[PDB]
């Protein structure tokens, strides 16, 4: 472990003390660390910046264009999709009408890839296809020009397949919705994906996460498909979220620097406008009621779908074999592997330290 | 048409001309060409660099990180192999064993994503697939470790589904070989696959290409699938080859710059180690027996295949669609679309011109 990460550790638990954190201690971490230098450098910026303004209380685009980078560099989202959708595959084998609930849609790929999936699928296509869309929070508070563009481009790709298919947007707030909203039929099979999603809703209290998979429950799924950040950012307290973070952080960090430039500015971006204010939001300032953006490890998540009455259903035999042909083009300095946590996750990581979690429950 | 390349063209019909060409037209275009600068630019030095060299006549490890460079930046290895393995799925699902031929393998990625849709398909896994592999030019003379690599690799792969699994490769030159050699037996289909290797055997004879699709034919493969440049480069005189050369490379030089940045090492080495050496190929100094590295049109191809006696097969009603999802990241400043040709032909194009074309026969 490198000495400005052991250093920023060590500044994090002298501040949760009773003497308290010495300012030339936390001024030597913030002059070693540097937003343009090597990823444990910048891991110390960010992270000494948090540390910084907790001790001193006491966009839309951004993300948007975050979110594309990292997905051109980094493998994450595409794992989390195409692992999920083999779960809906296999679920739903037996139905011939197909609705989609997506809680959390950012553009269209996830459902573009099932299509075809469905498309050619040993029961023969399904006769019809339906998707419910609520917009990802990454889409900002004005998402209509971006699902009404999703919209279109799903239904044109429907087309090319011969299959009957729709897709409807819900705009107002999940904490307003109720079943009769999803318009759920007795003869489709429904399935529910949670990517990237869910983690929102967890707060000091679990009410929100529990409106929301107790609707999910309520549609009756053959499956629903979780995918998650792994890392206990939750109710854990101030020293233990510290590390955790530094350590989570520390392997999408490295992630960054195998595939872009030390120059580029679009690798910044994801740095420091969702990297970086997620850093601030776990390590930062707030407390209790006002911390917000919390994440789990795969253990609470276990713990709050079996609470809510679902239970683990095994993913296909073949997830591990799609999911090493995803990784197939990574050159040799990569690191990413596939990790199984139980009782029935498969991670992607880095360095063998799990990061991108995906699951299927019913 | 930019002015810099409407004057190399003029400058190619002077060359041909009894006048001839005046160094002062071709160093004018010489100055205005750069290596580092616009695409056209590029693509002018490039040309320009050919045509002196003609006037004045009267590696493994380059082309093996281009290909790589070419493949992360560009879609169009993804698009060829994706699409010549929907149509052997499709041809082959009869069968319970398969043996694939392939005619110059690069590395394990086409036949692992083949290998995981095989696994997937309707009619169920195969009892036992088999995989014959001839190298690709690609991997230079001392192609053994880098092969033994892809063996393993596959093979590990193959474990992941549950199949009985072959890899073996044949050293000797393809002109050496005949039926015996490739092991074929009576129980199982059989696919040959030719991706961007066959266009290498086409010369002042077609001794070559006719002797290996015979070979082909002698398998009786359920199906033969050929993915080659769209560029007629073959009989075609001079001033007709240099101005499809010029067109063809001007939509690739475009698609790498949407792709990459001005200064990158890594598309300077495309440009140069595999562009700039295949147009020195076929607009440079050699002509006749001389001139190799050949390629030939659509409409071309089809003559020699039913020549050779093949006959069309019509591409997956879900070739478009795949193709389409491939596609679906880049975003709007790429040009990308597909285009059909005819008879059966399906094509990979950037600002609507064709450039890497795909089609199967039996």
């Not at 990460?5 to 030597?28: K, N």
């Not at 399904?126 to 999703?150: E, F, K, N, Y």
Request: glycine residues 4%; negative net charge.
């Amino acid at each position: 472990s490198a000495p400005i990460l052991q250093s920023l550790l060590s500044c994090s638990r002298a501040a949760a003390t009773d003497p308290g954190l010495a300012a030339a201690e936390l001024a030597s971490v913030r002059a070693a660390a540097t937003d343009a230098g090597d990823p444990s450098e910048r891991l110390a910026f960010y992270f000494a910046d948090a540390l910084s303004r907790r001790l001193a209380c006491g966009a839309s685009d951004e993300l948007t264009l975050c979110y594309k980078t990292l997905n051109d560099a980094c493998p994450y989202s595409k794992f989390a999709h195409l692992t999920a959708n083999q779960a809906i595959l296999e679920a739903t084998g037996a139905a011939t009408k197909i609705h989609i609930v997506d809680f959390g849609i950012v553009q269209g790929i996830q459902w573009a890839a099932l299509l075809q999936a469905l498309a050619t699928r040993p029961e023969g296509k399904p006769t019809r296809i339906r998707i419910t869309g609520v917009p990802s929070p990454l889409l900002g508070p004005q998402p209509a020009a971006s699902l009404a563009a999703t919209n279109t481009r799903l239904r044109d790709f429907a087309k090319l397949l011969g299959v009957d298919f729709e897709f409807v947007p819900l705009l107002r707030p999940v904490h307003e919705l109720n079943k009769s909203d999803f318009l759920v039929e007795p003869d489709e099979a429904v399935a529910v994906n949670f990517m990237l999603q869910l983690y929102h809703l967890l707060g000091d209290s679990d009410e929100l996460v529990r409106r929301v998979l107790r609707l999910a429950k309520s549609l009756s799924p053959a499956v629903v498909t979780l995918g998650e950040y792994e890392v206990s950012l939750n109710r854990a307290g101030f020293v233990d979220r510290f590390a955790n973070a530094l350590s989570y952080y520390r392997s999408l960090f490295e992630s960054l620097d195998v595939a872009m430039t030390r120059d580029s500015p679009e690798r910044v971006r994801v740095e420091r406008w969702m990297f970086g204010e997620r850093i601030q939001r776990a390590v930062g300032p707030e407390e209790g009621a006002d911390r917000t953006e919390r994440m789990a490890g795969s253990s609470e998540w276990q713990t709050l779908m079996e609470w809510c009455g679902f239970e683990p259903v095994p993913l296909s035999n073949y997830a591990r074999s799609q999911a090493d042909l995803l990784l197939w083009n990574y050159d040799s300095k990569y690191k990413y592997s596939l990790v199984e946590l139980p009782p029935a996750f498969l991670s992607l990581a880095w360095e063998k330290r799990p990061l991108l979690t995906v699951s299927a429950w019913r």
